[PDB]
Structure formats: C-alpha cells, structure tokens
Amino acid sequence: VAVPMDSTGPYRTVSHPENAPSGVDAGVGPSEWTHAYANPAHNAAFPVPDDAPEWIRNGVSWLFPEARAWPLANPPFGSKTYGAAEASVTQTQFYGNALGPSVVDGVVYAESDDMFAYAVNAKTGKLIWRASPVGNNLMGNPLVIGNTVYLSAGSVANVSFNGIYALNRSNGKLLWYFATPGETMATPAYDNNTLFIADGAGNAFGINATTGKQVWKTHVGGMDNMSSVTAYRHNIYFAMAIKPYLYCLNESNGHIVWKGTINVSPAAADGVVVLDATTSNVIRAFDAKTGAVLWTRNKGGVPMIHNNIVYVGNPVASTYQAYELKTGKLLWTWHVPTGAGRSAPTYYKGLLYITTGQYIFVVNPATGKELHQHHIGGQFGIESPVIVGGTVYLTNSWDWIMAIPLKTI
Amino acid sequence: VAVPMDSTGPYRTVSHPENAPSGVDAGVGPSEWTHAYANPAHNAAFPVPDDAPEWIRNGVSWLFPEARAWPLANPPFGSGAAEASVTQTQFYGNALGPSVVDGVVYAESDDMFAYAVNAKTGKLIWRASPVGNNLMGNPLVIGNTVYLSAGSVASFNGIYALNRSNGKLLWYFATPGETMATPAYDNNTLFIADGAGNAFGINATTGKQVWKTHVGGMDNMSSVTAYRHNIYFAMAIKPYLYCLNESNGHIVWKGTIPGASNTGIGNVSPAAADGVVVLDATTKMFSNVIRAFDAKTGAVLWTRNMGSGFKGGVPMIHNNIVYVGNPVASTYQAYELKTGKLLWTWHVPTKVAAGAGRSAPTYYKGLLYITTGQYIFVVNPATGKELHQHHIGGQFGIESPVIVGGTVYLTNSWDWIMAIPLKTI
C-alpha cells in the first residue's frame, strides 16, 4: 500500500528487532488491547502471576524520549507568547501524547501528536519500531490485536488527513488505512474482527479489522471530538457533539439500537453505561441494553468503573468523586491540591492512581484521602496510568514514554 | 537553543558537509534571498556571467525526494481530487518555491522540514525541523542565516533562524497567531504578519523584536513585501492592504480592493515596482479584481476585473508589465504597470480543474515560464501565445520557477525538489 513517503527519509519506519522482548518477556501483560484505556471500564490495571519474571514484579524504571521530547523540569515551551495554561494545552495538543500507552505482551505502544507511533520494550525501554504512516496527529492509544496495531489520525481543529491506519505489530510496516472525512481523534473500538469509529461529519463505520475494507456506514450526525467508541456486549456506544446524544449501534449491521441524552469516553460495566458532560458537570448512567436512564446526578471527566463503583473527575471543581454504579450517590470527593480531573483513575490492588498535572497521586478508594504523591514533571492532560505487575507505564504531554516501579510512588 | 526535540530523533538536524559546494560553485546564483519569489517584483530570474561554471550555463537535471515525497505520476492522495490536491499541498508538500543562493537550493515544506540541497548535484547538505508546524513559504537567506516561518491554516508560530552551513538553530521569534506568510528582509530586519492580526519588525541578527503593530484581521498566505523603506501586506477578515514603516512600524496607509471576499484578500502577496504596488483579490460566482496603488500615498491608480467563473493569482512585475494569473478563469493576463491597460489574455490549454494560474510567472531572457497544474509552460510575453509545454506531474500550487543560468529550479506539491535544464524546455 502506498502513502506519501521517502523510504530513506526521516518519516521512514525504523525497526530494531533485537530489543523486542522474547520468551517469558513476551508474555508479560495482556495479549490484546481493544479499547481506549484497554477495556470498556476504563480501568487498565493488570496483575501478573506469582511466577512472573522478576523485572515486572519488582518493577522497572526507564525513560524514553519521543521525537519532540521536552525536558520534564522545563515550563511549557512558548511561555511568553500564549501564556502558561494555553501553552500547556497547546504543547499537549500538537507535540506530546494526548492519551496513555498500550501494554501488550511485553511491549509498550504509544502514539503521539508528533505524528509517530512507538513500540517500546516494557523492560528495557529500547525501541522495537517507530512509524509515521500519516502526516497528522495521533490522539489516542494504539489498539493491539493479534499482529496488527491500529492507529487513529486526526487533529484538534479538511484539515490534514483522518482515519484509521493499521500496521504490523512486529516490524511496524503499513498494512492498510481507511480514510474518513471527519475527525478520528476518538479511539476506535475492536470487537470480533471489526473496528468501530465515528467521524466529525456525523458518520459511524464498522470496518473489517483484517482486510481494511468498509463493513457498514450509518449517519448519526454531529461531531465526535474526544469521545472514543466503546464496544460492549456486541454493541458500540459513542457520544456526538453539536447534537448532544449518546448512541448505541449494532456492531454487525450498523443499525441504531437506542439514543440517550443529558469529549468524554463513556464507560460500561455490569450492564450500565456512564457518561458525564457540561452545559456544571452532570453524570448519568444508562441501562446498556435498553437505553433507559438508570440515574442522574449533578470539560468533564473520563469515568472508570471497578467493583460497581464509578470514579470520575470534575474539571470545573478539580475533583475526583466515587459514585455507586447503580444508585449514583457520591461516596466521597477528593480535592486536588492547588487542569486536574481530566484523566481516568486507575484502581489496582486496593488503591487509586491518578495522573494529573505533573504528579502521579495515590488515593485511598475507601475514604478518598490522598496517601502519597510523586513528582514527575511535564504534563498529564488525559493520560491515565497503566499498571502491569509492579511497574507503572506512562506517557506525558512533553513527549515521553516512561516506566516507573510501583513501589517508588 | 533548546526547543522540544529528541537529539537522536527523526526530527534531529542532519548535516552532510561533504555535499556543500565550494570554490566558484559557492558563487553561483545570487548572494542573498530577501523575499518570497526573491524580490518585491516576484520575478526570480538570475542570469549568469560568461565565466560561470559549465554545469549552470548548460544546466543540470536531478530529482530530490523530500520526506513525504509522492510519485509524480500518481494522482493526489486522498481522492475530492481537487480538494485533495489542496489538502496535500497544505499538509504535506511545498507551498512555495525554493531559494537558490550561492550554489545551494533551500526549501521548506509542509512536511515540517527545511532542506539545503546542492544546486549542482542535488545531494542534501542539511535538513532541519526546529518546529512541529508547517512551513508554507520560501526560506530567506541573508548572510550566514536562513529564516523560516512556521504556521498552519488550522501549534507554535513565528520565525525560526537557522545556521546556513550546518542547519543548527540560531534563534526563534514566536508569534501569537500563525505566520504562514513568508516574512520580508530589509535593513537587518525581518517583517512578518500573523493570523492574530499583528505585524512585527524583528532584528534579523539578535532575534529580539523591534516593533509590534496590531493591524487586526488575518494574514494567511500574503507574504510581506519590503519596498523603499516600507512593508506592504494584505489582511483578511478585515480586508485591507497595509503599508507600514520599517523603522517604527506605524501605519502609513490602508487600501481596499472593491468587492473583495472577506477571506479572499489575504492570500496573495503584493508586488511592488517603480513606485506602484499591485494586488488582486477574489470576490465573495467567483471573480478576480486587480488594483494598483501608489506606493507612497496609497492612492488608487487603476483597477481591473480579470475574469469570472477559490483563490487569487500571484502577480509579477517586470519591465513595467504586470503578469498575473486568474485561477477562477484559468487565465494569465498582462497589464501595463502604470496605466492598467490589458495587453493580452492567455487561456491555459489543458483542463486542470484545480484552479491553474495562482502561481506567479517568471520572465527570463525574453520569455515567460509558468509552473501550473502538472506542467511548466513557456509563453511569449509579447503576444501571450503558448510556445512550449513540458510535463512534470504532481501539482504546482503557489510555486514559481527559480531560474539561474540555464537551469530551472522547482519544488512540487508532491513534496519534491528538482532541477531541470532550461534547454530542455
């Protein structure tokens, strides 16, 4: 397949197979990544067997510069022009990673607004491959299924090129692309050999995850900005702007199941689908199957559902709150010390992990009290911690991929 | 200077000093490039001395792929076809032509790299990407410094100044809005207008700003023209052509093109010669209107309607004749600089629906050279009759041929740098 490229140029695909994990190194972590935040619940927390290799259980520490990497100690580039907050958002949007990484079978995958996708070794941190099949930003986390990694191209604002690009997981070569007129900033969803994505022109597509050819097309209208498609129980759920509805569609034929009302990816667990939006911030849970509104209570946080508890942030209030999944009452509220509340929390072995600002926080899920805080630098806008074994894997808005031992925080 | 980068990453500065020309090869072509299309007249045509090297007088032929280079035979990536031509032009390939100075060809591309290539052989001297934004103009080469302007029509914007030899980053001046337009160099100073409505004088050595003037509106593709101590540039959304003082940046005069589309006036760079400043704009189903101003006072000299049937064409002034394209009508016209009299109109022979005719013609040794569509044309400046046509491929949006001796230098919207012998055309 042909894309605009100089095979000898700086945008060429670079492969270093010697650094790929091998043997028991290649079994570490999940064998697939099907969603933004790896699962419909938006909790990426992966335990390892008792006999797992020592490096992940004890934890590893490595720091990987991405193409436009900026020092974590430095303030936002472009300080005296845009302003501190505007430059933090701007560098996040056009330089660094918007979302977190994808850790599968001993390899950490990230795609950056610097227009490259990376596959890095989860143990050492050395590059397996790097690729730039498209000249546009990549605002999501790579989906790793079988031997194929799936990338989504799109920009914040007929602006460059948009769609899904699918490359070989091993060497990074380009398998196929499916171009769309509207934004694919949203992470697609994978289920049963099919990819599901919504554009900014109001169209949702099923796509064959192998051949790359289109399966079905359904026009819902509106714009999908940051809300990544969620595939749950044979149906796909996604939100649209300019006509603010949450849709449920049939994965096979693309028919519309139901619509519901009230930038954020909806979380689904235990037959419940949670979303929050702005007008303040209102969170609402739906019955996944029939679309009936389960509860409603009084921009926006990305929810996580674990053990029938929703943990979601309030960017206006700069807080994270824990809601009971079915009843929707808020158990506790934790105030961030003085853009907090963008990232989804990670609940692992009885603790909460939150990447916000330049820090990673650990919070007690029972009382909502901060236990520890660990300084890193850079910025975490929407990046969420990915915890596998005793090691935390992160991306940063200054274009970094890192590994930190879980003990260190 | 520190910008967001991985020093070993794919955006690092790559230097191949072995490919730099030396001896008499380092004198070939002009010793400075101060403007889009090299001069306020937008005619880049350089004759060579009789003792000039044999390769430049007879011409060389080579083709250089840029990072996103796409085969010239292939159709536009992402095929509507014409909109994909515009889209790839804007986000992948070169928007403007190259800058040939002292035996080296300089280009900046929307692939976010700047290149220094050997004018003789075609092998890369250096490549650099100090900023993660598009480069929509041609590099300004003055002394030992190359000047880049970064901005996107949709990041970080401004002038980035690189070492001419190895490509290292000397300094940058950041602007609030996009600077897609090529700046202008005059008297140790760079002059640029951004998409936030601001025009700046900037010290071309230290990089510190001299003056800042809030003009309002948006400068999209209209490159600053520095003529007789004054800078001239067009702004959209507030559709005026401005004349500013290079020293203090105060506004001398403002001017208007009647019926100009709100967004149609700010894409074209004004040409200046012999006390006259020429600009054209599209009407807000499409027409194109050209108007000439008195450089000093802004008084309206003459106005003409170029035709009907998108974008405006970039004018050239040579020997008191304006040659300008009309992409709406796919025509080029010749007007007398002072009187506005229409000498001839030439219709583009083949049908390229993209709006052929936006780029500025080049007049060299009694002939017109026009890169439009997939072809470069040779046209009689007297009769406006097509003489020759030469197929290349790709697309030429805003790029104009840079001719040095017997060699034509080109960039293409498929992200290519090429050299063709003038004899071949």
Q: Nearest-CA distance from B77 to chain A in Å?
A: 8
Per-residue tokens: A1? 């397949």
Cβ–Cβ pairs < 8 A, chains A and B: 113
**Which strands make up the sheet holding A256-260, listed edge to edge?**
A230-232, A235-239, A246-250, A256-260
Q: Which amino acid is at B425?
A: I
Domains and CATH numbers, chain B: 14-424 (2.130.10.10)
> How far does Cα A347 stand from its chain's mean position?
16
> Rounded to 5, what percent of chain B is helix, strand, coil?
5, 45, 50
| Residue of chain A minimizing CA distance to B415 | A4
Q: Mutate which of A1, A8, A16, A68 to test chain B, going by most B C-beta atoms within 10 A?
A: A68
Q: How far is CA B145 from CA B24, B123, B185, in A?
A: 20, 20, 12
Query: Residue B171: which residues within 8 A CB-CB, separation 6 or more?
Result: B1, B160, B161, B206, B207
Instruction: Give the C-alpha separation, A260 to A244, whole Å.
Output: 9
DSSP H or E stretch at residue B117: strand B114-118
Say if B171 is an interface residue toward chain A (CB within 8 Å): no
| Neighbour-count burial for A238-254, b at 16+ CB within 10 Å, e otherwise | bbbeeeebbbbbebeeb
Residues in Cβ contact with A267 at an 8 Å cutoff, skipping those fewer than 6 apart: A40, A41, A42, A230, A273, A274, A275, A302, A303, A304, A305, A310, A344
- From B97's Cα to the closest Cα of chain A, the distance in A is 19
Residue ranges of E strands in B262-406: 271-273, 276-282, 287-294, 300-308, 316-318, 321-326, 331-336, 342-347, 362-364, 367-379, 386-396, 402-404
The two structure tokens encoding residue A272: 């419940």
Contact B132 A179 (CB under 8 A): no
What is the distance between the alpha carbons of residues A112 and A118, in angstroms, rounded to a whole number? Answer: 8
Residue B315 has what DSSP assignment? P
> Would you call A73 exposed, middle or buried from its count of C-beta atoms within 10 A (0-12, 13-18, 19+)?
exposed
Is B42 within 8 Å of chain A by CB?
no
Give the residue from A334, A191, A396 showing the smallest Cα distance to A345. Answer: A334
For chain B, say whether A136 makes contact (Cβ under 8 Å).
yes
Alpha-carbon distance values, A176 to A164, A179, B24, B391 (Å): 8, 10, 49, 31
Measured distance CA(B354)–CA(A366) in Å, rounded: 63
Residue A77: count of CB within 10 angstroms of its CB: 23
Cross-sheet strand order for the sheet of A319-324 = A304-306, A309-314, A319-324, A330-335
Give yes or no for A4 touching B (CB within 8 A).
yes
**Is B69 in Cβ contact with A95 (below 8 Å)?**
no
Contact of A69 with chain B, judged by CB distance below 8 Å, is answered with yes
B176 touches chain A (CB under 8 A): yes
Interchain CB contact of B5 with A (< 8 Å):
yes
Greatest pairwise CA separation for chain A in angstroms: 58
Residue A131, min C-alpha distance to chain B (Å): 10
Contact B69 A5 (CB under 8 A): yes
- Rounded Cα distance, A389 and A32, in Å: 16
Answer yes or no: do B87 and A160 touch at CB < 8 A: yes
Q: In what order do the strands lie in the sheet with A14-15?
A: A14-15, A127-131, A117-121, A107-111, A102-104
- Structural contact between residues B363 and B372, judged by C-beta atoms closer than 8 angstroms: no
**Who among A78, A116, A160 is closest to B174 (CB)?**
A78
Q: Give CA–CA dist A383/A66, Å, rounded.
A: 15
Q: After which residues is chain A broken (C to N over 2.5 A)?
A: 157, 262, 279, 298, 338
Q: What is the distance in angstroms between the Cα of A35 and the nearest Cα belonging to chain B?
A: 27
d(CA B221, CA B213): 19
The partner residues of A354 in beta bridges, in order of sequence, read A361
Q: In what order do the strands lie in the sheet with A351-363?
A: A346-348, A351-363, A370-380
Asked if the C-beta of A183 comes within 8 angstroms of chain B's C-beta atoms, the answer is no
The alpha-carbon gap from A175 to the nearest alpha carbon of chain B, in Å, equals: 17
* B3 part of contact set with chain A, CB < 8 Å: yes
- Nearest Cα to A321, choosing from A338, A337, A307, A304? A304
Distance from CA of A95 to the nearest CA of B (A): 7
Pick among A3, A158, A397 to test the B interface (most B CBs inside 10 A): A158
Integer angstrom CA distances of residue A211 from A215, B79, B94 = 10, 20, 33
**Inter-chain touch A158–B87, beta carbons under 8 Å:** yes
Whether B15 has its CB under 8 Å from any CB of chain A: the answer is no
Distances, alpha carbon A379 to alpha carbons A43, A83, A342, in Å: 21, 15, 12
Q: Which residues in chain A are contacts of B176 at CB distance < 8 A? A: 81-82
CB contact under 8 A, B5 and A67: yes
B239 CB-side CA count, 13 A: 18
* A6 with B176: Cβ contact below 8 A: no
Residue type, position A145, single letter: I
Contacts for B132 with CB less than 8 Å, ≥ 6 apart: A68, A94, A95, A114, B4, B11, B112, B155, B156
Say which of B6, B69, B154 has its CB closest to residue A157.
B154
HEC string of chain A? CCCCCCCCCCCCCEECHHHCCCHHHHHCCCCCECCCCCCCCCCCEECCCCCCCHHHHHCCCEEEECCCCCCCCCCCCCHHHHCHHHHHHHHHHHCCCCCCCEEECCEEEEECCCCCEEEEECCCCCEEEEECCCCCCECCCCEEECCEEEEEECCCCCCCCEEEEEEECCCCCEEEEEEECCCCCCCCEEECCEEEEECCCCEEEEEECCCCCEEEEEECCCECCCCCCEEECCEEEEECECCCCEEEEECCCCCEEEEECCCCCCEEECCEEEEEEECCEEEEEEECCCCCEEEEECCCCCCEEECCEEEEEECCCCEEEEEECCCCCEEEEEECCCCCCCCCCEEECCEEEEEEEEEEEEECCCCCCEEEEEEEEEEECCCCCEEECCEEEEEECCCEEEEEEHHHC
DSSP B79-90: --HHHHHHHHHH
Residue B91 touches chain A, beta carbons under 8 Å: yes
Q: Which contiguous run of DSSP H or E holds residue B416?
A: strand B416-421
Whether residues A11 and B65 touch (CB distance < 8 A) is answered with no
Helix (H, G, I), strand (E, B) or coil at B23: helix
CB < 8 Å to B310, chain A: none
Indicate yes or no: CB of A4 within 8 angstroms of CB of B414.
Answer: yes
Residues followed by a break in chain B (C to N exceeding 2.5 Å) are 79, 154, 284, 309
Nearest CA in chain B to A71: B4
B342: three-class secondary structure by DSSP: strand
Residue A3 touches chain B, beta carbons under 8 Å: yes
Q: Judge whether A378 and A358 are in contact, CB under 8 Å.
A: yes
**Cβ pair B11:A68 closer than 8 A:** yes
**B11: left (phi > 0), else alpha (psi -120 to 50), else beta?**
alpha
Nearest-CA residue of chain B relative to A66? Answer: B6
Q: What is residue B220's DSSP assignment?
A: S
Cα–Cα–Cα angle for B45, B47, B53, nearest 5°? 125
Secondary structure letter of residue B397 according to DSSP: S
Distances (CA, A) of B308 to B222, B265, B303, B331, B337: 22, 16, 15, 10, 22
State the alpha helices, DSSP H only, in B205-250: none
Our CA-based measurement puts residue B93 at a distance from the nearest CA of chain A, in whole angstroms, of 10
CB A159 within 8 A of CB A134: no
Q: Among residues 148-167 of chain A, which lie with CB inside 8 Å of chain B?
A: 155-161
Give dist(CA A305, CA A286) in Å, integer: 14
Q: Do A69 and B6 touch (CB under 8 A)?
A: yes
Residues A246 and A238 sit within 8 Å (Cβ to Cβ): yes
Task: Give the nearest partner residue to B415 out of A4, A158, A159, using CB atoms.
Answer: A4
The structure tokens listed for A387 are 């915890």
**Chain A closest-CA separation from residue B337 CA (Å):** 38
With contacts defined as CB-CB under 8 Å, which chain B residues touch A120?
none
Specified resolution (Å): 2.8
Mutate to test the interface with B, among A11, A97, A155, A397 (most CBs of B within 10 A): A11
Q: How many residues are there in chain A? A: 409
> What's the token pair of residue B370?
């026009």
Please give the single-letter amino acid code of residue B375: Y
Contact B9 A68 (CB under 8 A): yes
